[PDB]
């Protein structure tokens, strides 16, 4: 009956996870090769990306770990005894 005048603080903690934003037109997983990823094959043009994150300030030098999700695929061919042949391809960030 003698409770003080109080104000409410709300927050969330979500450990162990990565903040996934899918590059899909409806934010869903209808397939690994999304529909916006195929819209850019037939467009055949280069676009620049300028992402801008607003974070909580910490009293410490921190890093930002962005996963640009690609298709990091390896195709392995062994045509003869002792012969190993691999072709690598990842798209978009080819190397």
């Amino acid at each position: 009956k003698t409770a003080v005048d109080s104000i409410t603080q709300k927050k969330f903690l979500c450990d162990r996870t990565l903040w996934r934003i899918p590059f899909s037109s409806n934010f869903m997983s209808m397939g690994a090769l999304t529909d916006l990823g195929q819209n850019l094959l037939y467009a055949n043009s280069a676009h620049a990306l300028d992402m801008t994150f607003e974070v909580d300030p910490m009293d410490e030098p921190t890093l930002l770990y962005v996963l640009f999700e690609v298709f990091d695929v390896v195709r392995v061919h062994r045509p003869h005894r002792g012969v190993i042949e691999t072709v690598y391809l990842r798209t978009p960030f080819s190397a």
Partner: protein, 316 residues
């Protein structure tokens, strides 16, 4: 099925591969193997692994347990039976739990051997674990105990350890001449000074140490024993678990272009492992085990024990 599945010829299951050429940097080492797959054999590389032997030093900052090992039921401010010099007279704060029969200049009589008075062995008797077993305060005229000398640095009882220097568990610094130095100290009633000593305190020098505790309250910065150092209070060290990482992260150089691994044929010598340093092969393997199996389970062979905070410690 009988045939066309498993061979009937002399074929091994597991092969052992000695390194062909090993080279060492000050921070890394390199192991070249011959992964020789014989005729008519298939090898899934999931069944391949590196068996590594060695000697790990976890360092002195490894504490695998909360609390302490030694005198955990002691109070944290409880001192050992100690001595100190004030202003130069020596004061004694001790305890005499043992109850004997008679006291002469040779110590305390623990019993007889026929009619000959058998006394206490000053190396380990009387024991600091043996006192009286009844609860009621009976009359104790001939008590005895053990006291650390003034040269022994004063520690609280909580967390104090000295190594035993004989077979019978008695601890005390031996000196060369290899004889122990355990002096006998005879005490009687203050208003009584015939003279009959009531308490015999076997003084000694032990190698006292606090291997897993530290002092949380030092009353005096100065060296030497004092009355103010009875009030020093011992706190256990923080538990530090030093181990290899989950799924052996950090043993294998992934995504280092200067430390890239090789799987190639012996003739063409064209490396099939093209590694790029903006990949995270470790996190690709930590997320792959989650999607294919129950990650809470513990598999010791790949050291598969996932890092997991307690849910009631993070969120109060």
């Amino acid at each position: 099925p009988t045939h066309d599945v498993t061979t009937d010829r002399s074929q091994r299951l597991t092969l052992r591969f000695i390194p062909v050429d090993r080279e060492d940097t000050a921070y890394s080492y390199k192991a070249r193997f011959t992964l020789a797959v014989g005729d008519n054999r298939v090898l899934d590389m999931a069944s391949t692994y590196f068996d590594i032997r060695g000697v790990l030093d976890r360092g002195p900052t490894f504490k695998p347990y909360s609390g302490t090992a030694y005198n955990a039921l002691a109070p944290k401010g409880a001192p050992n039976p100690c001595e100190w010099d004030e202003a130069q007279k020596t004061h004694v704060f001790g305890q005499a739990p043992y109850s004997g029969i008679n006291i002469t200049k040779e110590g305390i009589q623990i019993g007889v051997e026929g009619q000959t008075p058998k006394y206490a062995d000053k190396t380990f008797q009387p024991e600091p674990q043996i006192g009286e077993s009844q609860w009621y305060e009976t009359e104790i005229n001939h008590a005895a105990g053990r006291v650390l000398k003034k040269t022994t640095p004063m520690k609280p009882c909580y967390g104090s350890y000295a190594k035993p220097t004989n077979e019978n568990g008695g601890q005390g610094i031996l000196v060369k001449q290899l004889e122990s130095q355990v002096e006998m100290q005879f005490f009687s009633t203050t208003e009584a000074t015939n003279l009959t000593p009531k308490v015999v305190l076997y003084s000694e020098d032990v190698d006292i140490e606090t291997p897993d505790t530290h002092i949380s309250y030092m009353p005096t910065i100065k060296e030497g024993n004092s009355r103010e150092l009875m009030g020093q209070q011992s706190m256990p060290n923080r538990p530090n678990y030093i181990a290899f990482r989950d799924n052996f992260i950090g043993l294998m150089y992934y995504n280092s272009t200067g430390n890239m691994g090789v799987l190639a044929g012996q003739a063409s010598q064209l490396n099939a492992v093209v590694d790029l340093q903006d990949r995270n092969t470790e996190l690709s393997y930590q997320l792959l085990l989650d999607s294919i199996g129950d990650r809470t389970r513990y598999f010791s062979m790949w050291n598969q024990a996932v890092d997991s905070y307690d849910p009631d410690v993070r969120i109060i």
